[PDB]
Design a protein around this nucleic acid. Structure first.
Lengths: 100, 100, 151, 50, 137, 209
RNA sequence: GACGGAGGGGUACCACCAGACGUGGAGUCUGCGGCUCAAUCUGACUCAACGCGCGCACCUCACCAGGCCCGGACGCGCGGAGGACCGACAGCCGGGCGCGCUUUCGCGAUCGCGCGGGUGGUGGUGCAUGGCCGCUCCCAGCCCGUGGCGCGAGCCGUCUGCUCCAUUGCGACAACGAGCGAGACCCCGGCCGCGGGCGCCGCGGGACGGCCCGCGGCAGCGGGAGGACGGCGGGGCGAUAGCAGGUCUGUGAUGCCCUCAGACGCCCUGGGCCGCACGCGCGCUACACUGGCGGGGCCAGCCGGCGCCCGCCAGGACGCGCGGAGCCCCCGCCGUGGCCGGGACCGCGGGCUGGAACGCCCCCGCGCACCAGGAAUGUCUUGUAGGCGCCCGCCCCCACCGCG
């Protein structure tokens, strides 16, 4: 009924994580979902010398994999929160995890 | 080394039941997981990393298993000739089936 | 520490109708302005007195220009986060210049004052476009490269 | 015996998850990945050039 | 406010005098040998440095108010560059022992009350520090 | 204020590193499948694996047993959830448009002694039959000489640079191993008409009104 | 085609103007040569070798001085249960190891023995190679279908006219249509909406040489603006044709030879790579008053937590949910002296990470040259150079280094 649930949505692609957010908002009308919270992107950054061998000007390959997390808090019964999650559209490579 | 029959049986029991085995590096991490042989007075143990590697290499040579190596990990897959080998080793009937 | 989640939370509402922002190279002046006595506090410290001396006259520079009596009757709780000592003073000045104008109301006389001030000190109502550039792999700076050992 | 001496721990053994090379293992994040092997598999992980 | 109205530098020097004349703080006198932290190379020659340091530390406790400050944290405020090596200078916070000693006396003189994590200025102390600033200016 | 430990993305990173090993294994093991792309559903610990490959009939349909054997291998190799770790196999349409299925056939054809010129041209034709606007092949290495030689065969127009190519070009590299030693097959296929994205340069004007 | 000390256009702080800030000169720090060595593992030599191949107590690790054992699989013949295989108390010898031995006590088919054949090897050759990557090239060039021209090699389109930052355009032209590269694109800004706020984070606008004044077949350009923003903010991607560029020491990458049981397998120990008569490359700190030194304020971003007490610090114990630079500014001291410039070795001492210093840290001594670097050359145009700190990488500990 009123038991708070903290949910986290993590995705490599901003658009793919956005799809889950738009789906959660639509299916959150029924169980009163909170507005989404978009976390500062935490980025795994690897700058590597591109050359396998040192020969050549030292050159740097900048690789970034920023991870986007969205925060959802619903004071609703567990069956209701499971109903939002199963019903909301799911895209592969998107992670949703629930903490009580 | 004189590999225990208990170790040997657990490798083949995991292989007959799950139809798939794997191995990492020599350095032990509590020994090889997925293989829980018991000495008669011994507590549930894990075969030494070296022990599983020698038998499975011999079993690949016999024709018991087929292997693909990815990310320094073994990926054994059961062969039908191997089903006869493991079934004879476990003195099992053909009606007995692996989890597939 | 610039652009914090709550723009101004030490003081909330409390007659603070006028709101303005002055930007200066990572210096954000979140200005909370109300129609008060006519004295102002920046980061909870009096506008007239700031720790750097040379910079104190610059901080009071927009005040005298857009009518000190006009500024009288306005109290401010401007907070500057981020930036640096020089960057902070310029961003408070930009917020102060904009802060009097919005409250005054847009009419011919306000417009005349705005023109007089922006002519006297340029880029006072316009945030500095320049933002620190990024070092590349060539050397230690955005433009500078390492010494060429063999030409 | 050889048993009692083989691989007595002397140091941490760290190798790329993909290539098993000790040099340039990389521990910046959870990725214990070879610096040379990283570039080849960066795309499957999804690390991308700016 | 009012603490800000007094030039803080003016308040700190006077507060060291207020501490000496009113007997507050009491300089340890074991402070003679210590230099103000690892960075300093020549050691304090002011000879009223513990009274001078004490005056600002209590003013800092007032400036934070409810925020709550710690002995290592105050040392970060007093940090200076360390020089004298071929390697380039890097900032070095001050030694904990002198700062910890200053906070201890204030709790005894009711200028400090322990809060969550670090200690914070006591209500009796809050009035005394603020009263001096207005009185001085 | 919030704590910064946030082990949420750490979990997400072991999921993405795991997808990479899965690919490494799928690519070597499923040569017949011409495996191309993998992922994990990973929903509340249910590791469904989405794999899009040209043909699952070789690995699945054998009583579905071989697919099951792979699922058990992956759960057991990743020491994770058994029964939750299903693999969902699919079939890829327009295998000529896909680079991986054409490169996997090229490596087999070349190893089977099919002539280099014809073999690259057979692949070139598949993209043209599929209608793909441009396919190239750059086999390189000890090609019929003690010294290294590179044989590039190409048909049609292929873009080479810019951001578009990342999302409009298909690249696949295989290492063939003839008696001489390592050779490097390559396939690059460019289609302006792929999914819902337009090559940025072309403004489309079609009618008077 | 390559080239010219041939001409004509252009063009770029990897070019010069006009300047800056420098190096080279001194200590130091890292790499290289030379050499010394038991071992100093190497690779790389103009640009395009030389703090490079992401931090050497051990490990790494390829090298040495000694040792340990199979991790010779799977198959054919042959031997083998009182034993095929296969450890061991004490004493010995030996850092050490039932390593060997004296010795007498086990093991339990998990095998021996030859062979057919494996298997590994940071061994070689990047002049057998894949892959990647350097470089030509921070280049604007590269090609096609048909037709024209020549016996052909080859030309024409692909321009001896004009504009670009640009084969960027235009008006042409035995060519006429296409492409690829450049653009476009994409990330990150600086301004404006709305949506969102467990964290100022999610989608849109705006800016176009559009407007003005010119000069212009044109293409544009030269000013003037208005406007956060101006005509190329900054980066990512980066054609074609190549190079005997570099890596077999990243790669169940890899040809082929060598090594293969006293192994080039793999471990265990201790030292090596850091040894210095030397020459050199990249950096750092200096050579002081525009400066040090003693206090007082206090301002950051990448993106990141702390309290308590003990100690001169260093550090540690105790606890827990969180936090932040220099420069600069204000007052003092020195008073042009290698001085209160500067901090080099060494004499101790107290500590840390550590199985272990041979690493680092701090304190108390000490007080090295250098008083502005010869011939030479390098980098560099707005938030730019430089000054000034912080983060992160490899990291047991450590950076003067690189990514920022």
């Amino acid at each position: 009924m009123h038991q708070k649930y903290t949910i986290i949505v993590v995705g490599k692609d901003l658009k793919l994580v956005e799809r889950y957010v738009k789906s959660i908002v639509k299916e959150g009308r029924a169980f009163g979902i909170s507005g989404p919270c978009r976390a500062p992107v935490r980025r795994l950054t690897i700058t590597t010398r591109k050359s396998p061998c040192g020969e050549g000007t030292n050159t740097w390959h900048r690789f970034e994999l920023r991870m986007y997390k969205r925060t959802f808090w619903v004071t609703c019964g567990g069956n209701d929160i499971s109903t939002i999650l199963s019903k909301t559209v799911v895209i592969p490579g998107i992670q949703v995890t629930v903490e009580v | 080394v004189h590999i225990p029959k208990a170790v040997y049986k657990a490798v083949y029991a995991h292989l007959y039941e799950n139809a798939s085995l794997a191995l990492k590096e020599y350095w032990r991490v509590g020994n090889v997981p997925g293989i829980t042989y018991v000495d008669e007075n011994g507590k549930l143990c894990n075969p030494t990393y070296l022990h599983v590697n020698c038998i499975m290499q011999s079993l690949e040579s016999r024709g018991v298993v087929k292997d693909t190596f990815a990310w320094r990990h073994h990926y054994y897959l059961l062969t039908e000739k191997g089903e006869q080998f493991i079934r004879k080793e476990l003195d099992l009937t053909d009606d007995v089936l692996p989890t597939p | 520490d610039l652009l914090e989640r709550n723009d101004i939370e030490v003081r909330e509402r409390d007659k603070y109708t006028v709101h303005t922002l002055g930007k200066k190279k990572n210096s954000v002046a979140v200005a909370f302005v109300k129609a008060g006595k006519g004295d102002i506090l920046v980061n909870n410290v009096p506008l007239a007195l700031v720790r750097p001396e040379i910079l104190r006259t610059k901080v009071s520079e927009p005040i005298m220009i857009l009518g000190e009596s006009l500024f009288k009757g306005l109290d401010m709780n401007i907070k500057v986060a981020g930036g640096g000592h020089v960057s902070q003073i310029y961003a408070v000045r930009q917020a102060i210049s904009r802060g009097v104008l919005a409250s005054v109301k847009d009419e011919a006389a306000r417009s005349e004052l705005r023109a007089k001030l922006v002519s006297y000190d340029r880029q006072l109502v316009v945030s500095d476009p320049r933002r620190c550039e990024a070092k590349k792999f060539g050397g230690r700076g955005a433009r500078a490269r390492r010494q060429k050992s063999y030409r | 015996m050889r048993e009692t001496e083989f691989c007595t721990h002397i140091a941490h053994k760290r190798e790329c998850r993909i290539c098993g090379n000790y040099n340039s293992v990389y521990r910046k994040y959870g990725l214990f990945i070879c610096r040379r092997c990283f570039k080849e598999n960066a795309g499957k992980i999804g690390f991308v050039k700016l | 406010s009012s603490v800000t109205r007094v030039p803080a530098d003016v308040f700190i020097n006077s507060f060291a005098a207020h501490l000496k004349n009113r007997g507050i703080i009491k300089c340890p006198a074991f402070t003679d040998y210590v230099k103000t932290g690892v960075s300093r190379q020549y050691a304090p020659r002011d000879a009223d440095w513990f009274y001078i340091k004490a005056a600002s530390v209590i003013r800092h406790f007032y400036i934070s108010g409810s925020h709550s400050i710690g002995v290592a944290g105050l040392a970060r405020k007093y940090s200076s560059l360390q020089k004298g090596k071929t390697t380039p200078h890097h900032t070095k916070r001050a030694s904990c022992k002198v700062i910890r000693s200053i906070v201890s006396q204030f709790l005894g003189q009711k200028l400090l009350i322990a809060g969550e994590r670090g200690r914070h200025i006591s209500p009796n102390g809050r009035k005394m520090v603020e009263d001096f600033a207005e009185g001085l200016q | 204020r919030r704590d910064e430990e946030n082990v949420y993305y750490s979990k997400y990173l072991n999921d993405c590193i795991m997808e990479a090993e899965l690919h490494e294994f799928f690519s070597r093991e499923l040569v017949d499948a011409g495996y191309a792309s993998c992922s994990l559903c990973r929903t509340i610990d249910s590791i469904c694996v989405i794999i899009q490959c040209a043909e699952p009939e070789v690995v699945m349909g054998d009583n579905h047993y071989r697919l099951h054997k792979i699922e058990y291998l992956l759960a057991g190799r990743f020491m994770c959830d058994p029964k939750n770790f299903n693999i969902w196999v699919d079939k890829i349409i327009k295998r000529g448009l896909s680079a991986e299925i054409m490169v996997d056939n090229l490596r087999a054809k070349l190893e089977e002694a099919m002539p280099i010129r014809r073999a690259a041209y057979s692949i070139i034709r598949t993209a043209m039959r599929a209608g793909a606007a441009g396919c190239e092949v750059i086999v390189a290495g000890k090609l019929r000489a003690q010294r290294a030689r590179a044989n590039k065969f190409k048909e049609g127009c292929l873009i080479s640079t810019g951001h578009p190519k990342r999302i409009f070009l298909a690249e696949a590299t295989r290492h063939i191993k003839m008696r001489q030693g390592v050779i490097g097959v390559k396939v690059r296929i460019y289609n302006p008409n792929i999914r819902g994205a337009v090559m940025p340069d072309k403004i489309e004007i079609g009618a008077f009104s």
